[PDB]
Coordinates of C-alpha atoms in Angstrom, one line a residue:
X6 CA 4.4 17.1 -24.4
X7 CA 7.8 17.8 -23.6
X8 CA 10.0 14.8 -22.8
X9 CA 11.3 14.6 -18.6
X10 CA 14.3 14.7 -18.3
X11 CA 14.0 10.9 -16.4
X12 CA 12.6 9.8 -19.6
X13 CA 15.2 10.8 -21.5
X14 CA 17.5 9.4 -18.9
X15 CA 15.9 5.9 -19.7
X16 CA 15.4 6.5 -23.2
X17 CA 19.1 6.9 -23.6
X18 CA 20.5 3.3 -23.8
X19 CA 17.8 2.1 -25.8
X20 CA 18.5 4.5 -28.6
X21 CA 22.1 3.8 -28.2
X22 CA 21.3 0.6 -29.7
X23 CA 21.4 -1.8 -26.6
X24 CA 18.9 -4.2 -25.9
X25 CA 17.0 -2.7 -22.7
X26 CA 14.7 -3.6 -19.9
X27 CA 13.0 -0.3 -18.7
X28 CA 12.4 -0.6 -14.8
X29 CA 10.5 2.8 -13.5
X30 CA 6.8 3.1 -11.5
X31 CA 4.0 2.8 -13.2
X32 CA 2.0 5.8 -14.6
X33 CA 5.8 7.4 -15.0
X34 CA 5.5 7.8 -18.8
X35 CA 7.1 4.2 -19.6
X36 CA 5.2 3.8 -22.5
X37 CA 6.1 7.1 -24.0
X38 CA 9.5 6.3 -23.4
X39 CA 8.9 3.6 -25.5
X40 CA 7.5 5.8 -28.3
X41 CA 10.5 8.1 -27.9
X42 CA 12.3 4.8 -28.9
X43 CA 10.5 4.0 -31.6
X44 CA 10.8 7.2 -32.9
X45 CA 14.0 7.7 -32.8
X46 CA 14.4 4.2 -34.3
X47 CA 12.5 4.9 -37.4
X48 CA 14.6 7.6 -38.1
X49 CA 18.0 5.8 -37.9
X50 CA 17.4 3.7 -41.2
X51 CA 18.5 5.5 -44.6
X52 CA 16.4 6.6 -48.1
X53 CA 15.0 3.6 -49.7
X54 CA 15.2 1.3 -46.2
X55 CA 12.1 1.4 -43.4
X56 CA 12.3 -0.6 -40.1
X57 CA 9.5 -2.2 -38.8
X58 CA 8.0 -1.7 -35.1
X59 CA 6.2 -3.9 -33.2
X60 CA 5.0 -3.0 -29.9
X61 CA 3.5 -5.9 -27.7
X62 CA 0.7 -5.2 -25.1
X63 CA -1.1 -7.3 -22.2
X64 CA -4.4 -6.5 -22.0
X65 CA -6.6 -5.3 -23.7
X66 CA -7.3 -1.5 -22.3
X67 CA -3.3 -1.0 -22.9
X68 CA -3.4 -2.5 -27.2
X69 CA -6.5 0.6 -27.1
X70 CA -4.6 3.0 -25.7
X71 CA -1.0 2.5 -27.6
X72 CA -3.4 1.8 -30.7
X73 CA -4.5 5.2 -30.5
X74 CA -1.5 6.9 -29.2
X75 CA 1.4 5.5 -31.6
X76 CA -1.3 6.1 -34.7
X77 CA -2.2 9.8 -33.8
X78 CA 2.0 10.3 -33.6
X79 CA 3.5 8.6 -36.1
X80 CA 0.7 8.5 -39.0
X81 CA 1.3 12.3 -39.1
X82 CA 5.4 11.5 -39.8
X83 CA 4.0 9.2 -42.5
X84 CA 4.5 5.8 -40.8
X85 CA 2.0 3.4 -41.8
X86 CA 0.4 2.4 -37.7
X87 CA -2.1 0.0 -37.4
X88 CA -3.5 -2.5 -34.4
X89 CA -4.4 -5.9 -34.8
X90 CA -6.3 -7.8 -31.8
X91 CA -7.9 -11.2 -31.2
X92 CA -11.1 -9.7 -32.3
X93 CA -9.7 -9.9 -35.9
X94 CA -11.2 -9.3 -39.0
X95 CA -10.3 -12.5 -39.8
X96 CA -10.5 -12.1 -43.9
X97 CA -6.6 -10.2 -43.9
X98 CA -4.0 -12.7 -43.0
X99 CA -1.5 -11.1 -40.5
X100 CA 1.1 -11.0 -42.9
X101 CA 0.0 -8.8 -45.4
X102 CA -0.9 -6.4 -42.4
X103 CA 2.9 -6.8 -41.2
X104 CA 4.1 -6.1 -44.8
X105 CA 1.6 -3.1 -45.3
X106 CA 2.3 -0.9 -42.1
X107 CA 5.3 0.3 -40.0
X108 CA 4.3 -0.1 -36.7
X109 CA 1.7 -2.7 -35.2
X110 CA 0.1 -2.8 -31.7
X111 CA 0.0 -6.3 -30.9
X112 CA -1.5 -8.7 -28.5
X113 CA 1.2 -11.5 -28.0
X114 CA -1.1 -14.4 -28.6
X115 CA -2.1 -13.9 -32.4
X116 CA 1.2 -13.3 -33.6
X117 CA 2.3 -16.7 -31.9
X118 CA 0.1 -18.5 -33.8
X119 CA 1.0 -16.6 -37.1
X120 CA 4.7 -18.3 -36.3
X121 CA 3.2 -21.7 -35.9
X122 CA 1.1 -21.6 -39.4
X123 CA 4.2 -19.7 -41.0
X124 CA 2.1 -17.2 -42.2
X125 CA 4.9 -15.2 -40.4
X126 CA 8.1 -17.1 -41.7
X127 CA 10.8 -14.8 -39.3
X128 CA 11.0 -12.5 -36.6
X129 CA 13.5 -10.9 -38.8
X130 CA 10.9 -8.8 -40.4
X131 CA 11.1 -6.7 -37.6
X132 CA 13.6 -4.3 -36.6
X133 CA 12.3 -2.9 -33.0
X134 CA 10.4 -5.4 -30.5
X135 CA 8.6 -3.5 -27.1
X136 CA 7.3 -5.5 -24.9
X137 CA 4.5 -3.9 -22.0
X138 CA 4.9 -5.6 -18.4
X139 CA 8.1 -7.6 -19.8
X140 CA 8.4 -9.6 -16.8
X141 CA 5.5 -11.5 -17.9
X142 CA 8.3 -13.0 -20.2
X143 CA 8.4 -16.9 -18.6
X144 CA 6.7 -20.1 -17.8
X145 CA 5.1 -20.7 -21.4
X146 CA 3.7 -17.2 -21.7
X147 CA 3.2 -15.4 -25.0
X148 CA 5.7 -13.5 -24.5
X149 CA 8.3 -16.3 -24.1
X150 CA 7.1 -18.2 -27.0
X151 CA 8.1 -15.1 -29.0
X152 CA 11.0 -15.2 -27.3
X153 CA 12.1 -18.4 -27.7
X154 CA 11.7 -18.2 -31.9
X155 CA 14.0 -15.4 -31.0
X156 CA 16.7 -17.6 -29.2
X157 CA 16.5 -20.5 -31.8
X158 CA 17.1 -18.6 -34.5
X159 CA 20.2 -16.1 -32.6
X160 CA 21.6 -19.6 -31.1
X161 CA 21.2 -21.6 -34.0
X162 CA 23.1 -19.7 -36.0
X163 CA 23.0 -19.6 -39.1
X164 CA 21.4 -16.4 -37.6
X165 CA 19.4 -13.9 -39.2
X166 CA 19.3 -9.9 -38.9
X167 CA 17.3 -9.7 -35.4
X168 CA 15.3 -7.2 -34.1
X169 CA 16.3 -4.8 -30.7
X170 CA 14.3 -5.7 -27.9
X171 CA 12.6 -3.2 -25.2
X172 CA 10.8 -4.4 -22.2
X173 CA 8.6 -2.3 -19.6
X174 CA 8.1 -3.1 -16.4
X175 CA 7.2 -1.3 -12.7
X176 CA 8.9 -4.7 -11.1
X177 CA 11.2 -7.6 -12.6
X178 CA 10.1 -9.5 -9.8
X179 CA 12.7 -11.7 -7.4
X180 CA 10.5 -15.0 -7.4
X181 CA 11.2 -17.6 -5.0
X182 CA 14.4 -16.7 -4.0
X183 CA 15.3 -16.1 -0.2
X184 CA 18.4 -15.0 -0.8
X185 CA 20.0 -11.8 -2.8
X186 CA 22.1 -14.2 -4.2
X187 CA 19.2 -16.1 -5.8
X188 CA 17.5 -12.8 -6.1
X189 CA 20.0 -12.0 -8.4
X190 CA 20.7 -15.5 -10.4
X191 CA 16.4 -14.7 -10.9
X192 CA 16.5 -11.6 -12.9
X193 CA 19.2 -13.0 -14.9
X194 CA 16.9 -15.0 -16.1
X195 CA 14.2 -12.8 -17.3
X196 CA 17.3 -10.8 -18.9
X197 CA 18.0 -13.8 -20.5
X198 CA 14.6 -14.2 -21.8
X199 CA 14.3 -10.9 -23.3
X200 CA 18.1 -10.9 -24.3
X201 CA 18.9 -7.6 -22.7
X202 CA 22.3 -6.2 -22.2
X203 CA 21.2 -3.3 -19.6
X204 CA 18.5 -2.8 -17.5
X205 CA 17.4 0.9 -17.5
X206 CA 16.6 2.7 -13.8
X207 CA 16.4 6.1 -13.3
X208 CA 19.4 7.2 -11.2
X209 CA 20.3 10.7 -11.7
X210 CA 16.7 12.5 -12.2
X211 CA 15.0 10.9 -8.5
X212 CA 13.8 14.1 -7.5
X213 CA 12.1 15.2 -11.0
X214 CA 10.3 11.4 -11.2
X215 CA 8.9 11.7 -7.5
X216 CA 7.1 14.9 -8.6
X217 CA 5.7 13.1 -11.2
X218 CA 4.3 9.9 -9.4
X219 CA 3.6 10.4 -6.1
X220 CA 4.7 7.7 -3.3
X221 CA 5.7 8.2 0.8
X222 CA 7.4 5.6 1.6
X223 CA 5.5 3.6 4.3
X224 CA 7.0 2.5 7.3
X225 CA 5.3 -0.3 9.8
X226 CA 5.7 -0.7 13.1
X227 CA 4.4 -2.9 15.6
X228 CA 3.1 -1.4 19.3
X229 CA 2.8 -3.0 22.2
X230 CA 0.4 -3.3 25.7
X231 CA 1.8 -2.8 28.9
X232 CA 2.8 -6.2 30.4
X233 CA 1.1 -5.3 33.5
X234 CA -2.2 -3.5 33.6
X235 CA -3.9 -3.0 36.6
X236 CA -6.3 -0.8 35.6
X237 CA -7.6 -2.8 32.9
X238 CA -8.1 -5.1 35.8
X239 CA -9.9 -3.4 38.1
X240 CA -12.3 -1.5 35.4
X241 CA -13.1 -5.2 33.7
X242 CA -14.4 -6.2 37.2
X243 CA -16.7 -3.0 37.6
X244 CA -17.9 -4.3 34.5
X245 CA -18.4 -7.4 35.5
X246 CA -20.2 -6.2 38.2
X247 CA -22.2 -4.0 36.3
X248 CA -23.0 -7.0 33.7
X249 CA -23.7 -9.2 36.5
X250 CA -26.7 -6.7 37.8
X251 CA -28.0 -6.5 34.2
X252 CA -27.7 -10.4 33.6
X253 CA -30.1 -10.7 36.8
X254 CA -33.1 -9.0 36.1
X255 CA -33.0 -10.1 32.4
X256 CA -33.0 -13.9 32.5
X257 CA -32.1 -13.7 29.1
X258 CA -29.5 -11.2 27.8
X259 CA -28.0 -12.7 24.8
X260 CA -27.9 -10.1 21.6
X261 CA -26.9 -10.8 18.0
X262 CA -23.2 -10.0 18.8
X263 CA -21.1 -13.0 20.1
X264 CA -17.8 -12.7 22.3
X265 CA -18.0 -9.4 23.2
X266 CA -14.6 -8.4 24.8
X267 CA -13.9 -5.2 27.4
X268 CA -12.2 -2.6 25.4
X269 CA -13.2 -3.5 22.3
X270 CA -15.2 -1.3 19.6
X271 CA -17.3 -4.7 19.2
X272 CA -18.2 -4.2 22.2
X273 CA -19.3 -0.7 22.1
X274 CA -21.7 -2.7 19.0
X275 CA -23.2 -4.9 21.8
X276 CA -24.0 -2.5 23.9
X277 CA -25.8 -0.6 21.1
X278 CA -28.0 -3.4 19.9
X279 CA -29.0 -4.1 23.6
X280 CA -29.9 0.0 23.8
X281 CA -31.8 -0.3 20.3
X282 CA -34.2 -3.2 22.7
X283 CA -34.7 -1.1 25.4
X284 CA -35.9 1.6 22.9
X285 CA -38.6 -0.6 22.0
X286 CA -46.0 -4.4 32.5
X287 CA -44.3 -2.1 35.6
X288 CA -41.3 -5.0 35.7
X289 CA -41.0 -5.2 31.9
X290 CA -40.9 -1.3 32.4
X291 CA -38.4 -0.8 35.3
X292 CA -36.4 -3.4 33.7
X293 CA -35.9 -1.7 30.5
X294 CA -34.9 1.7 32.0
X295 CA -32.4 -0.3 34.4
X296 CA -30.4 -2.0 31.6
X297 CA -31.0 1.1 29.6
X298 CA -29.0 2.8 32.6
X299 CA -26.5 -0.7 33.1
X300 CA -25.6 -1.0 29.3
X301 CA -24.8 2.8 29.5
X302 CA -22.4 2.7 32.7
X303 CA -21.0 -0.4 30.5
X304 CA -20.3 2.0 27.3
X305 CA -18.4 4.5 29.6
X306 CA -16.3 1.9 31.0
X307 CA -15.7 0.2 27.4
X308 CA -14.8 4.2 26.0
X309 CA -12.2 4.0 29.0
X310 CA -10.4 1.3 28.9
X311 CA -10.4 2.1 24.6
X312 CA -8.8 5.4 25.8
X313 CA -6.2 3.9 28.6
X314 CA -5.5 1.5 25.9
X315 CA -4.0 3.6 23.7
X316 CA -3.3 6.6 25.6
X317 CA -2.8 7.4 29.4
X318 CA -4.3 5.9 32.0
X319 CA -4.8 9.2 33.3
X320 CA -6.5 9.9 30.0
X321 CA -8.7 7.3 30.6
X322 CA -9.3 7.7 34.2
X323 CA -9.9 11.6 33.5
X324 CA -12.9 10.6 31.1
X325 CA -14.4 8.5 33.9
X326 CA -14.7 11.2 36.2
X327 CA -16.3 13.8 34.3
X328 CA -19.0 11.2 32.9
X329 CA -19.4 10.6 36.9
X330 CA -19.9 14.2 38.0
X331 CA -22.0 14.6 34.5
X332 CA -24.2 11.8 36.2
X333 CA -24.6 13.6 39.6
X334 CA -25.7 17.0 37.8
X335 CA -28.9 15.2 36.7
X336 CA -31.1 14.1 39.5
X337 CA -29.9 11.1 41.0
X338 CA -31.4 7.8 40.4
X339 CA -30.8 5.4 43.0
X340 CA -29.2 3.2 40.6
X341 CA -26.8 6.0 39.7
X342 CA -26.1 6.7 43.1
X343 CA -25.1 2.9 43.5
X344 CA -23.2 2.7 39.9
X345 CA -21.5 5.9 41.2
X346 CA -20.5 4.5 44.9
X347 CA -19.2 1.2 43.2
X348 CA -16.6 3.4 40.7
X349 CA -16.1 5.5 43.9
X350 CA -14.6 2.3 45.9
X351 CA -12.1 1.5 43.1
X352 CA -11.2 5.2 42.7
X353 CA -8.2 6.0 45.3
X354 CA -6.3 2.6 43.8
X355 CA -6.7 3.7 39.7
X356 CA -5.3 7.0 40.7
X357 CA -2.7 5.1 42.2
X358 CA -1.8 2.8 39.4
X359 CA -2.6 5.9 37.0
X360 CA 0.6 7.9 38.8
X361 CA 2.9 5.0 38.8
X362 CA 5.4 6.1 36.1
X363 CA 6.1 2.1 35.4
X364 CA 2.7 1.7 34.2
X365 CA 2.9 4.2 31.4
X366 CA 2.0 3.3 27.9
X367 CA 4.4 1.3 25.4
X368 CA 2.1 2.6 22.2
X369 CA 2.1 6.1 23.8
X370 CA 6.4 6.1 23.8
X371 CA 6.9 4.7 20.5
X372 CA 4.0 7.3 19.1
X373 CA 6.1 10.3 20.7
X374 CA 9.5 9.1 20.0
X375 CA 9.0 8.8 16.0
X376 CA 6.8 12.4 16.0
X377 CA 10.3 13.5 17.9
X378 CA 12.8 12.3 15.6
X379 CA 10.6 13.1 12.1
X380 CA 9.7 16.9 12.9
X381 CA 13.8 16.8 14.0
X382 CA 14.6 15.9 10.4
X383 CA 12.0 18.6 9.2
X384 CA 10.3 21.5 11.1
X385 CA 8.0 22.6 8.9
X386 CA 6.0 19.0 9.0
X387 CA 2.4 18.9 9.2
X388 CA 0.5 15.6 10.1
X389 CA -2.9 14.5 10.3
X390 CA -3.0 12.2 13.6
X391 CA -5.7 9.0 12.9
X392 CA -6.8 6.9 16.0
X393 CA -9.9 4.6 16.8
X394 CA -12.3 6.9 18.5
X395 CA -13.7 10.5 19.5
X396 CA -12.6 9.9 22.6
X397 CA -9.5 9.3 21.5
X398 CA -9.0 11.9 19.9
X399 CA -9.8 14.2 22.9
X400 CA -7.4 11.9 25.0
X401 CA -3.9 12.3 22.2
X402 CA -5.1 16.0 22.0
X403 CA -4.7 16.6 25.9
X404 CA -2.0 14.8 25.7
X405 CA 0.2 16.5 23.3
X406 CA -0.2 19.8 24.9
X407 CA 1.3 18.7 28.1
X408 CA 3.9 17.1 27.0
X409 CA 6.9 19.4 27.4
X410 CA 9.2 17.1 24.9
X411 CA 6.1 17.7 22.4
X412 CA 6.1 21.6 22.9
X413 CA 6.9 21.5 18.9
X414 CA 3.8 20.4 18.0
X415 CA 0.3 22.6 18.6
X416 CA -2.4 19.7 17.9
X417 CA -5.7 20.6 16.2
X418 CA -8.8 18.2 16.2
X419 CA -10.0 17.2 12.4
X420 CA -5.9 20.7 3.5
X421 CA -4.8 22.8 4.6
X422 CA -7.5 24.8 6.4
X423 CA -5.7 25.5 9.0
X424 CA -2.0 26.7 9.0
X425 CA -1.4 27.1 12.1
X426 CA -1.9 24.1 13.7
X427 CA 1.3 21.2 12.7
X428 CA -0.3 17.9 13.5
X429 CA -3.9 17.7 13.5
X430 CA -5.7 14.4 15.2
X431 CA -8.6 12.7 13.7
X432 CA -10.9 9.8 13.6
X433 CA -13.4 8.6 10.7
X434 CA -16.5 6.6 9.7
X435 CA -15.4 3.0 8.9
X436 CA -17.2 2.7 5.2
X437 CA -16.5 1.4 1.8
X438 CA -15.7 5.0 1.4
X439 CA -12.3 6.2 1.2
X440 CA -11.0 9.4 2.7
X441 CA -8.6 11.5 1.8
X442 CA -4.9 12.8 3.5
X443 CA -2.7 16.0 2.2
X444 CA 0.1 16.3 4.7
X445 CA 3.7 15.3 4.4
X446 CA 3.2 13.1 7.4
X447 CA 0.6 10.3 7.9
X448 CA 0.6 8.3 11.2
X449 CA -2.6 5.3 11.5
X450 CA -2.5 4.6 15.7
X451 CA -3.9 1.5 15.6
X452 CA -6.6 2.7 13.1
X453 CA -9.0 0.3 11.0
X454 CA -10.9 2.6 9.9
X455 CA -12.1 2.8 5.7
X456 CA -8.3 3.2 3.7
X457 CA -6.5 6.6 3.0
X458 CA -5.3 8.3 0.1
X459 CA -2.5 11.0 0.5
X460 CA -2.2 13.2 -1.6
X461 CA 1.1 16.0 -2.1
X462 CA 9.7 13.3 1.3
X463 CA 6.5 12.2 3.0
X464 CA 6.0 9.3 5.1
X465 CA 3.0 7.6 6.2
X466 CA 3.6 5.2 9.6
X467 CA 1.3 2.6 10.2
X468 CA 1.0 1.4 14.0
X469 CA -0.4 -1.9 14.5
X470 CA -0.8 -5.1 17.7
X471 CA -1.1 -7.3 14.8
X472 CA 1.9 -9.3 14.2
X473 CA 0.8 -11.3 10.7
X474 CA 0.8 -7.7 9.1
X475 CA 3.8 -6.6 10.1
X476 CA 5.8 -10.1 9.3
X477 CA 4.1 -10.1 5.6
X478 CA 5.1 -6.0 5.3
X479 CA 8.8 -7.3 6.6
X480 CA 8.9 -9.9 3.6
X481 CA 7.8 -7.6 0.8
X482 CA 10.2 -4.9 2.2
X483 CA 13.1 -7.8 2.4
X484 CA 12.1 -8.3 -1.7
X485 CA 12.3 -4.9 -2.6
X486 CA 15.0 -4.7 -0.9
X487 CA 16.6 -7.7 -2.8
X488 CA 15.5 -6.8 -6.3
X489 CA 17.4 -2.6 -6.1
X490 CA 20.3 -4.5 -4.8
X491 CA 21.3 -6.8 -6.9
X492 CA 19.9 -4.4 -9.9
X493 CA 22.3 -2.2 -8.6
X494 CA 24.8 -4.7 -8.8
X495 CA 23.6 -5.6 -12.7
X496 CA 24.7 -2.3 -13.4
X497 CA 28.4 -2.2 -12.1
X498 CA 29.5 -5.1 -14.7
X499 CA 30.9 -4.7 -17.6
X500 CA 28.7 -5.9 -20.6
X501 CA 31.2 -7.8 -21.7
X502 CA 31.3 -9.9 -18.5
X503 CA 27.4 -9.4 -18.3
X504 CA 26.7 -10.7 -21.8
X505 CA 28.8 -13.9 -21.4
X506 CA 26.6 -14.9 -17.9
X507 CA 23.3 -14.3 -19.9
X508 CA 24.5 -16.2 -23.2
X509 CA 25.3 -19.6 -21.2
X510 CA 21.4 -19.3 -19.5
X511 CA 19.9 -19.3 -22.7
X512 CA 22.3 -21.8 -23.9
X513 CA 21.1 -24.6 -21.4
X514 CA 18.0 -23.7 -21.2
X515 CA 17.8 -23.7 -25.2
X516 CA 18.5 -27.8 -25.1
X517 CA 15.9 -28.3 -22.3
X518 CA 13.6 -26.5 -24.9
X519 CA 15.3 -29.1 -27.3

């Protein structure tokens, strides 16, 4: 297990001495950065003197893991490792455990009570402190009150040999701050609390750690509906119309679905449940075949407006037809034939509204505009395409390939199979299944379907109507966005300056302690 080169870049001021937070994502080898630490540690102290390690973790499955990792290490270098957990033994005091080996993986809470009986008299003992998810380190938590015993004794000094400090964190957190400023005034404080001097992000070796744990960067964006939509309007009254029929002959149509709405997939649910009835005497049997026939015009309709929803209205409009010359190449029904003369009325005015350039499709523009300005940056982009329904699917396909400022792209339905096709578009059982994405370009077009995995700069874009989402993704991204900053800031002052603002935090909040 060779050390990264990002690890070593974290690593560094640790080993230099410094008290350190270590702020990296998780599953990026934090915790073996830690052992590189300790290891290096260990080594520092001369014949006839040993340092002593502890390494503090959160729960449970992390104490089992370090337990057995920093044992399998470092009991082969001839350190003395053992774990001690709040299922104890009970019959060994802590203390002559502490005394008998050099390192100990530690849940926080038994060693605070250890301090409390006096068992442990000092944190002296110890030379190295690590501390897994460090930002725990506040508000009364274990953590803290080791931390605290820490301060007294520094502050109150009269002071003691004390131990260097590590912490390991994927996120200091920013708190309740709405401001950078305050964002910044935050982490302070959890510096503070673990008395660090430098906080440890990986800066020069980016490109080596995104190899290692793989994250695109997601991007939301809100869509859309036309302000005016006519067609909408004049397929909602042939389904009105179409209802109204149905709602006649069956005195009694409401079926287990409630507030069905035109253009909705809940709908296309509604529709089905009525169909799974007629599935199941002359009047009850005409009746069933004519909502059998209603319910179906109804689905063809609800497909459409689905279709001109998120696509073109020509799209849309285009589906309607062929569904209406796939009717006529059956035999007629007389019901048909009247279903068929009612779209047929409408017809001449949706291909008017359908032409009118001003009625074109907000969703549809910002979809284009972003596949535009992404396959700019990189050619060589492939991207799987994930919208709502089949139809849909049929619809963005047709539509890409007439689109002469998409010429870039050659779209494929449904990695990779298939190199030749760039952007492929697809739709997916909603389950508690997950499926699975390899492309460096992910786009959800209004798609709820069951969550995606990708898989290998790569981007996934997530296209939603629904404003709550995108206001809550526009917070966390604001938070973020405050905690690099003003970490980035951390960095540029001296220690000198930096040590003197953490030493007066710890100083008044010592007497409030007091």
């Amino acid at each position: 297990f060779k050390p990264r080169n990002y690890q070593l870049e974290l690593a560094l001021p640790a080993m230099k001495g410094k008290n350190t937070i270590i702020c990296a994502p998780t599953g990026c080898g934090k915790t073996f950065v830690s052992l590189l630490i300790c290891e290096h540690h260990l080594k520092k102290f001369p014949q006839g003197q040993k340092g002593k390690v502890v390494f503090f973790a959160n729960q449970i499955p992390v104490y089992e893991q370090q337990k057995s990792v920093f044992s399998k290490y470092f009991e082969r270098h001839g350190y003395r490792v053992t774990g001690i957990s709040g299922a104890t033994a009970e019959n060994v005091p802590v203390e002559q455990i502490v005394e008998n080996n050099d390192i100990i993986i530690l849940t926080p809470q038994i060693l605070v009570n250890n301090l409390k009986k006096g068992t442990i008299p000092s944190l002296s003992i110890f030379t190295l402190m690590i501390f897994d998810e460090c930002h725990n380190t506040s508000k009364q938590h274990p953590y803290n009150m080791i931390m605290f015993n820490y301060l007294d004794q520094k502050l109150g000094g009269s002071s003691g040999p004390l131990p260097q400090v590590i912490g390991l964190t994927a996120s200091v957190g920013v708190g309740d701050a709405k401001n950078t400023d305050e964002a910044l005034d935050y982490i302070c404080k959890l510096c503070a609390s673990l008395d660090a001097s430098v906080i440890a992000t990986v800066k020069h070796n980016l490109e080596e750690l995104e190899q290692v744990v793989y994250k695109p960067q997601k991007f939301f964006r809100k869509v859309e509906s036309r302000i005016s939509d006519k067609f909408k309007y004049i397929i909602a009254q042939l389904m009105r119309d179409t209802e109204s029929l149905a709602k006649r002959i069956c005195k009694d149509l409401e079926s287990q679905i409630q507030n069905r709405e035109f253009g909705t997939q809940k709908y296309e649910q509604w529709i089905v449940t009525v169909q799974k009835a007629c599935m199941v005497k002359d009047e009850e049997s005409r009746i069933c075949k004519a909502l059998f026939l209603y319910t179906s015009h109804l689905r063809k309709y609800n497909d459409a407006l689905i279709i001109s929803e998120h696509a073109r209205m020509k799209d849309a409009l285009d589906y309607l037809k062929d569904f209406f010359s796939n009717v006529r190449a059956a035999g007629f029904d007389e019901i048909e034939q009247d279903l068929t003369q009612r779209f047929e009325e409408k017809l001449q005015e949706l291909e008017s509204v359908s032409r009118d350039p001003s009625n074109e499709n907000p969703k549809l523009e910002d979809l284009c505009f972003i596949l535009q300005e992404e396959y700019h940056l990189n050619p060589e982009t492939i991207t799987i395409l994930f919208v709502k329904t089949r139809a849909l699917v049929d619809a963005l396909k047709n539509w890409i390939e007439g689109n002469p400022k998409l010429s870039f792209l050659k779209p494929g339905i449904l990695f990779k199979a298939s190199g030749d096709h760039n952007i492929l578009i697809a739709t997916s059982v909603a389950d508690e299944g997950i499926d699975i994405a390899q492309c460096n370009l992910v786009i959800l077009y209004e798609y709820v379907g069951n969550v995606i995995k990708m898989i290998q700069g790569s981007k996934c874009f997530l296209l939603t109507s629904n404003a709550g989402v995108i206001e809550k993704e526009q917070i966390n991204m604001y938070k973020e966005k405050m905690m690099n900053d003003s970490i980035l800031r951390l960095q540029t002052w001296d220690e000198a300056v930096f040590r003197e603002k953490i030493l007066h935090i710890q100083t008044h909040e010592k007497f409030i302690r007091d």
